[PDB]
Amino acid sequence: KFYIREPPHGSPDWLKVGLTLGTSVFLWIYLIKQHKEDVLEYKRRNGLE
Amino acid sequence: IRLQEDPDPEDENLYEKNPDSHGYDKDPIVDLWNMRVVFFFGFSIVLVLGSTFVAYLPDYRMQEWARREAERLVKYREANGLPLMESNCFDPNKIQLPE
Amino acid sequence: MLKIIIPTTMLLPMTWMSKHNMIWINATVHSLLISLISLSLLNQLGENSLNFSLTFFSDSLSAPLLVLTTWLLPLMLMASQSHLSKETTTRKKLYITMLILLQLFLIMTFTATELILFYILFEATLVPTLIIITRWGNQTERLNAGLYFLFYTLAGSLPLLVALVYIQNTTGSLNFLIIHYWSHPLSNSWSNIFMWLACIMAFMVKMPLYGLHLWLPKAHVEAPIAGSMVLAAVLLKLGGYGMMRITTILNPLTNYMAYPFLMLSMWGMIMTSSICLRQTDLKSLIAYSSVSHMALVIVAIMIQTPWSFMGATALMIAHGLTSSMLFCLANTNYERVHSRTMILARGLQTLLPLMATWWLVASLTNLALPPSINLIGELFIITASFSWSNITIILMGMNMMITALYSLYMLITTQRGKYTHHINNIKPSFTRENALMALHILPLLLLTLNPKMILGPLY
Amino acid sequence: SSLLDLIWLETILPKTTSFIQMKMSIMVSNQKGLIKLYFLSFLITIMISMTLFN
Amino acid sequence: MPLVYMNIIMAFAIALAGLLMYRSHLMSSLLCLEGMMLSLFIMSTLIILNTHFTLANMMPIILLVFAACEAALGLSLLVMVSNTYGTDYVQNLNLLQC
Amino acid sequence: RLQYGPLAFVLGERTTRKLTETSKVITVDGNICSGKGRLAREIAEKLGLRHFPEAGIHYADSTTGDGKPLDVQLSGNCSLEKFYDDPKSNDGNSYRLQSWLYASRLLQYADALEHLLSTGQGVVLERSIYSDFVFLEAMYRQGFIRKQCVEHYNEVKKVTACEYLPPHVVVYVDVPVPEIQSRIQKKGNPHEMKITAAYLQDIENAYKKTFLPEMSEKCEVLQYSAREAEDAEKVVEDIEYLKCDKGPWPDQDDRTFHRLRMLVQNKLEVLNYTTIPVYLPEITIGAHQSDRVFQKFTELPGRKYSPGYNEDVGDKWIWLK
Amino acid sequence: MNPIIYTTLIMTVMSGTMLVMISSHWLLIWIGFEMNLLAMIPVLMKNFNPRATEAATKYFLTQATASMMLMMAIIINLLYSGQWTITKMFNPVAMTMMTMALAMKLGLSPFHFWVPEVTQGISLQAGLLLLTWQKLAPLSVLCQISQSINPNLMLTMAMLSILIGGWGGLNQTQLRKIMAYSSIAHMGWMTAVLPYNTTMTILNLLIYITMTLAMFMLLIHSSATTTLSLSHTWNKMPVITSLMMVTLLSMGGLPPLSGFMPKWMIIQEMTKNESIIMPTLMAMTALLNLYFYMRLAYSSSLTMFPSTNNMKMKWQFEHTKQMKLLPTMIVLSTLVLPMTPALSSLN
Amino acid sequence: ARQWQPDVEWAEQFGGAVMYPTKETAHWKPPPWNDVDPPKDTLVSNLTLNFGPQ
Ligand SMILES: CCCCCCCCCCCCCCCCCC(=O)OC[C@H](COP(=O)(O)OCCN)OC(=O)CCCCCCCCCCCCCCCCC
Numbered sequence A: 001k002f003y004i005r006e007p008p009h010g011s012p013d014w015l016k017v018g019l020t021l022g023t024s025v026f027l028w029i030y031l032i033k034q035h036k037e038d039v040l041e042y043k044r045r046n047g048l049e
Numbered sequence B: 001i002r003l004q005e006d007p008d009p010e011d012e013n014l015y016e017k018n019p020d021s022h023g024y025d026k027d028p029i030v031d032l033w034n035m036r037v038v039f040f041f042g043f044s045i046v047l048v049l050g051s052t053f054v055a056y057l058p059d060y061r062m063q064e065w066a067r068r069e070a071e072r073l074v075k076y077r078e079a080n081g082l083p084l085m086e087s088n089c090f091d092p093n094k095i096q097l098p099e
Numbered sequence C: 001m002l003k004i005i006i007p008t009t010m011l012l013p014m015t016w017m018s019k020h021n022m023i024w025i026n027a028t029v030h031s032l033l034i035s036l037i038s039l040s041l042l043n044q045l046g047e048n049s050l051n052f053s054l055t056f057f058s059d060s061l062s063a064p065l066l067v068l069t070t071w072l073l074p075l076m077l078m079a080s081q082s083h084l085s086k087e088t089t090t091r092k093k094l095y096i097t098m099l100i101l102l103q104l105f106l107i108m109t110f111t112a113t114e115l116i117l118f119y120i121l122f123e124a125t126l127v128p129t130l131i132i133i134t135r136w137g138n139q140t141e142r143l144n145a146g147l148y149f150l151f152y153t154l155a156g157s158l159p160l161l162v163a164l165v166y167i168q169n170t171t172g173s174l175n176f177l178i179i180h181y182w183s184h185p186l187s188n189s190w191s192n193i194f195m196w197l198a199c200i201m202a203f204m205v206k207m208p209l210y211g212l213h214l215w216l217p218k219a220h221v222e223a224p225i226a227g228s229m230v231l232a233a234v235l236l237k238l239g240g241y242g243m244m245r246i247t248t249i250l251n252p253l254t255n256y257m258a259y260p261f262l263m264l265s266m267w268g269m270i271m272t273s274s275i276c277l278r279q280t281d282l283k284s285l286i287a288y289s290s291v292s293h294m295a296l297v298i299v300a301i302m303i304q305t306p307w308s309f310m311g312a313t314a315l316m317i318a319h320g321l322t323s324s325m326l327f328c329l330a331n332t333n334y335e336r337v338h339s340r341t342m343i344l345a346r347g348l349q350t351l352l353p354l355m356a357t358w359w360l361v362a363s364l365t366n367l368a369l370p371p372s373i374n375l376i377g378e379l380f381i382i383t384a385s386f387s388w389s390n391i392t393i394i395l396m397g398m399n400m401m402i403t404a405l406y407s408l409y410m411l412i413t414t415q416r417g418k419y420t421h422h423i424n425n426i427k428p429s430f431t432r433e434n435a436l437m438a439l440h441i442l443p444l445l446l447l448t449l450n451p452k453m454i455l456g457p458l459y
Numbered sequence D: 001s002s003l004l005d006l007i008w009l010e011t012i013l014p015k016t017t018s019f020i021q022m023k024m025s026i027m028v029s030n031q032k033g034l035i036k037l038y039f040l041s042f043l044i045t046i047m048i049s050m051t052l053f054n
Numbered sequence E: 001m002p003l004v005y006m007n008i009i010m011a012f013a014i015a016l017a018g019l020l021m022y023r024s025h026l027m028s029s030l031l032c033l034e035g036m037m038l039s040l041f042i043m044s045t046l047i048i049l050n051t052h053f054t055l056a057n058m059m060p061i062i063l064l065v066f067a068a069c070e071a072a073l074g075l076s077l078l079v080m081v082s083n084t085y086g087t088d089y090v091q092n093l094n095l096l097q098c
Numbered sequence F: 001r002l003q004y005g006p007l008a009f010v011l012g013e014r015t016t017r018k019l020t021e022t023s024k025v026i027t028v029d030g031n032i033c034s035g036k037g038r039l040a041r042e043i044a045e046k047l048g049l050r051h052f053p054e055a056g057i058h059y060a061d062s063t064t065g066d067g068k069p070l071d072v073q074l075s076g077n078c079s080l081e082k083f084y085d086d087p088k089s090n091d092g093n094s095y096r097l098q099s100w101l102y103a104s105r106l107l108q109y110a111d112a113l114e115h116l117l118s119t120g121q122g123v124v125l126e127r128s129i130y131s132d133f134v135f136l137e138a139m140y141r142q143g144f145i146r147k148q149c150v151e152h153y154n155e156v157k158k159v160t161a162c163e164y165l166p167p168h169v170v171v172y173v174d175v176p177v178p179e180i181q182s183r184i185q186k187k188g189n190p191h192e193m194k195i196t197a198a199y200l201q202d203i204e205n206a207y208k209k210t211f212l213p214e215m216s217e218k219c220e221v222l223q224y225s226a227r228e229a230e231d232a233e234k235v236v237e238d239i240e241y242l243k244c245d246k247g248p249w250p251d252q253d254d255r256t257f258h259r260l261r262m263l264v265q266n267k268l269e270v271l272n273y274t275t276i277p278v279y280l281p282e283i284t285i286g287a288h289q290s291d292r293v294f295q296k297f298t299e300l301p302g303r304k305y306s307p308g309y310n311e312d313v314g315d316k317w318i319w320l321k
Numbered sequence G: 001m002n003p004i005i006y007t008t009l010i011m012t013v014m015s016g017t018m019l020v021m022i023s024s025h026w027l028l029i030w031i032g033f034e035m036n037l038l039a040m041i042p043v044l045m046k047n048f049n050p051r052a053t054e055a056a057t058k059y060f061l062t063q064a065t066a067s068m069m070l071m072m073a074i075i076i077n078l079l080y081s082g083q084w085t086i087t088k089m090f091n092p093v094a095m096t097m098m099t100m101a102l103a104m105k106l107g108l109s110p111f112h113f114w115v116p117e118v119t120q121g122i123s124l125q126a127g128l129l130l131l132t133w134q135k136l137a138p139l140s141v142l143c144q145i146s147q148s149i150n151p152n153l154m155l156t157m158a159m160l161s162i163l164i165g166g167w168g169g170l171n172q173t174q175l176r177k178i179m180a181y182s183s184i185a186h187m188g189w190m191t192a193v194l195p196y197n198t199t200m201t202i203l204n205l206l207i208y209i210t211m212t213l214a215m216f217m218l219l220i221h222s223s224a225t226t227t228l229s230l231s232h233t234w235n236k237m238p239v240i241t242s243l244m245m246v247t248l249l250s251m252g253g254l255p256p257l258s259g260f261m262p263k264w265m266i267i268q269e270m271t272k273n274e275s276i277i278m279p280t281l282m283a284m285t286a287l288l289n290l291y292f293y294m295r296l297a298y299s300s301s302l303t304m305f306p307s308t309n310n311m312k313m314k315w316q317f318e319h320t321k322q323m324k325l326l327p328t329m330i331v332l333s334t335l336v337l338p339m340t341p342a343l344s345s346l347n
Numbered sequence H: 001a002r003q004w005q006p007d008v009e010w011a012e013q014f015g016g017a018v019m020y021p022t023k024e025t026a027h028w029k030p031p032p033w034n035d036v037d038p039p040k041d042t043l044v045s046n047l048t049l050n051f052g053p054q
């Protein structure tokens, strides 16, 4: 112990950390799925593959 | 006085602590290696290697190519009695003047 | 060009992630490596330019300027590490970051293939320079110097932006290759006169032209040593490069519109040399010598002949190297005695011999001494001006005489005579300062050995 | 050095422009903050826009 | 256009000129501001009644509602100014400068 | 919630609900070397209130980082001992000390108000910002400080102390100046032994003529002599039987308490006007010295980053914080 | 003011602006303007003092006069056309009345004095909300009715705004008055491009709003309302001063920063319409704004002004409240020049 | 032997009510630190009434 008063950010807010990581993972997987669906729809409409 | 101001510090001499100082850093080892890297890289690498690289850069400006082409053209034109330098750059037949 | 651009953007995080005592070493080593890499741009073709991609291209005019910039960065690092010993780590890294950003902007400026991207980059070069001047200048006048520099450049350059967007609307493209191939003559009209004026005036203010040059002594005298080195060596060459680039679409209006600028350049060359004769400040003398040399370059570009452009390119490279070396020498003297007065320190030949040798060589290169590339460029410009008219020889001879006079006046005042008795803190010259002078002077002599590398596309 | 560089090249381009800008800035910013005054200005502007603009 | 519309528009113009020319009192200018909306109400209802725009007959009432909302706002600001200075004179509103 | 703010207020946290009618602000005052400190200790312990010793130099050091005091060059730049030895210094030590002590008292009053509004427990302070000016007048009438220093003090005090609630109880301990000097001589500390009689008299005059008349109008004022102050049982009994409904505390509401709590929990907003651009030679610091001292303070162990993000003092999980 | 009352007043201001921006009826647009003003006055008077009361009084008088003129224009347009839909106005007199009313609401010259007066009078949060949102709404109305705008009147008022903003900002030392004159100049630029490209008007609006939010939030973070108060920020938190310096450089239009994009696009668009004199004058006049931005930058970050002694306690203490989206606004206001072609998405 | 940094003269140059003072602007004064002006000593002037004798 160093500080005379417990700092507000003394320990990680695990709820916020978990929500942040989950939001990042969800956004990345959603973006990958959206890009795949966009490529498939573009190919289907233009009659490429 | 109008402020609580520091006095102007005395000039710091690098030779006082380190008599054999190269003038790069206060730390002796850091200063020595700064001198070494500067001298090695700059002088040796850049100067010598870049100078020989520029000296032996290939003839991409086609100076010698132009000279050989000129030699061939002069030989051919003086062998056949043609003028060495043509009067026109382009073909007057291919040029169509206005009426 | 990415093989050179990306290493600078990697110099940035390396500078910010290196240790506190290793920033100078790492920056110098990797700047020298980047310069060596950029030495490969000198292999140019005789027919056309090096068109790497749709965005960047290199030419016999851009290549020497890029090599000069990449070589100038580590010398600036050496001088900055000289004068920034007591700074904090964060501020040292910020200064190095400003230098790196300036080099990156200059590289992209010299290699930009469109006029609007070139405008954006050559205007972006102002911010790091202004920050450097007004933040790490020593005296009070740095703020006024920065204001003058910024406002001169911007008041010159904004009509250039308007003219560039107008030209894009009229012709369809600002790509340099397209505007060179699809160029059409400029008829004698008021609108064309003012378009020519917008472009030429922007680059003339950048040059600077005589009568538009006060910002140059203001900024050069009051900027730190690295800022002074970059201002004279490279930042003055943006105007000449731009004029040699834009004048493709400004014909035949350049035959008639160039008279006032030619007269200003010649007479102000004479006047600034005479001013150099009577300068009580060494930095001001160097700055006015720079003004005279760039006035000669302006004369070359305005007369606009294949012999004038080669001389302009050679003189620009030579002036960059020589002015950087002179500023470094004057800065070492200032770091000795903490004053810029020329007559304060005397007998410096008997107090510091090898620095006297460096001063002698720098002064001999400052005046046109054969076979130096300074003389090569000046002689080509003088011959082209002679073909233009036969009294330009009178003006050029007067300028050469005054140039020799003030160069040797500076040398004799600073180095010869008897030393000042009460100045007793002139320590022996450092290995770092001697190496800085050697790295300034040797490439100039090697360029003298091989002169076709700096004679431009017209060679 | 003195007459041209330090006096007249400074007087013509940079100093005169700065003086004009300072004078205009003082003129614009020198207001007593009176709603009566600048609402009279509003009335004049409205009349001018109605009449002189068609 | 008939002369009735001319008179109503002239009344609006007069009330607008009155507001733009203060004398001493803020209350007098508030009264000038209230008259402009009265002229607007009269003009709007004269136009709507003449063209038999049946569904537009509710517009003047909304106009009156927001008119008296503005009047309430002006009265509140006037009481605050009068508490601050002792009079509703607009000369006292000079702390802020342009 | 989880931190006081508008969200907590709209959730329903109310200061009036939190209070227990024993939440009182009591300030004990007196001349130099009185029994005011011991009286405050006894009153605080008997009434179960939190005691706040006098806010001298390094109080902010005690409340931030680790409780240990920092260097005088980094916290305060003033010396009470030097003020005693050479009161008429040419470096502005006297007014630097006075302004720093006023800022420290302002900080302590903000802390006490925050504690009272967040816990409901009363606070007994050994001195307040309302009593601080007596030493300013004592310095001014003795020629120690200047009229410009007094004017700057008045401006800062106005714009700062105009925003807080006066104490519920003001307890003044009256001790005659000869007795003050006798106690000083008995204590034997040389610097305070150098205190002159006129300086002590000016403090008492300021207390008697300005502070006590000013505090009487706002709320109750209790005055005791040495013997009366020594017997704290009667003092606490007198406090417990005080009838008063003319103070601003009864007029305070939930919204006013919300605004006051939002103000006092923000320590940088409390000290906002303690540094106003008034360039007195006593309190102004040059650019170079300011930069050097700021660098030294940042080089202090647990001061480079925020409290939760200082690895050198044993903070882990920084990369996930 | 109760927090619930404050948030409901903010919601009502936003409701009025959204009603203006979604309505297709002139009466509903006027209703939105009235609701916005009615809920905006107490926001100005939130921190009660004579200066705030005077600022609110001046703002109310100006906006009430503008609303009266706007309703008169609506009625006159209805008389000659019988139409309530917001389209190209059918009467030139009504169009002139509407143009003058919307210019007065925006603060375009010569209807500008209330902008510096009120901005100085009110606090920093009130000034931020005022500038941003109260420019957001009338510009929407003008963009809707652009095709009937008189180019001469609009460009005259725009150039006057640019010149007057430059000169006023040159003279001022107060940060709020400086921000107000900057707002006047930026509104001038936007309304100058308005009669040609409402897309460029919207682009300039977005960039100006981002830069203004960043600057105001930096001022709130530093709690500085004057030049000398800002001169002490380098001794407490030097990062904020550097961020303010780069934001000031961006607001001056210096490349390669975000502030150059609106000026560049507007100059290009006006050049496409064979306008050269106006773009050149507008480009040259902005150097005054750049000058006083640079003067502010000299005092705050590029030089070190003297500090005081209680700054040591300020060092000891840490900032509590966290600004929301401040880093995002600082990044978006300086480093979005390479993302210029997104204005097509804005189209 | 050190970089010049602004002093009290520079700060007082930048610390006026406005830049570029004139006579009127010199008569002007900067606003209060907390934007709260001192209250004015206005007189309530209560109505005085004679209740009686008639
Ligand atoms: C459309 C959404 C717009 C934004 C809505 C939210 C605004 C208020 C919240 C952000 C406040 C500033 C950011 C820094 C907060 C620091 C305090 C902290 O610890 O925050 C933790 C937080 C993660 O918390 P968590 O709840 O997990 O977030 C995911 C959602 N549940 O950490 C963070 O939130 C940090 C990352 C924030 C993301 C960057 C900001 C939004 C950018 C969106 C992309 C578009 C960029 C341009 C925006 C303008 C144009 C649209």
Ligand SMILES: Nc1ncnc2c1ncn2[C@@H]1O[C@H](COP(=O)(O)OP(=O)(O)O)[C@@H](O)[C@H]1O
Pocket (backbone or CB within 6 Å): F031, F032, F033, F034, F035, F036, F037, F038, F054, F056, F080, F097, F098, F101, F132, F135, F136, F192
């Ligand atoms: N504003 C002030 N200016 C100068 N000195 C002060 C100030 N406030 C307190 N002091 C000094 O701090 C000390 C406070 O202790 P004191 O009042 O003697 O009570 P105690 O005897 O219980 O310690 C005194 O020596 C006093 O001189």
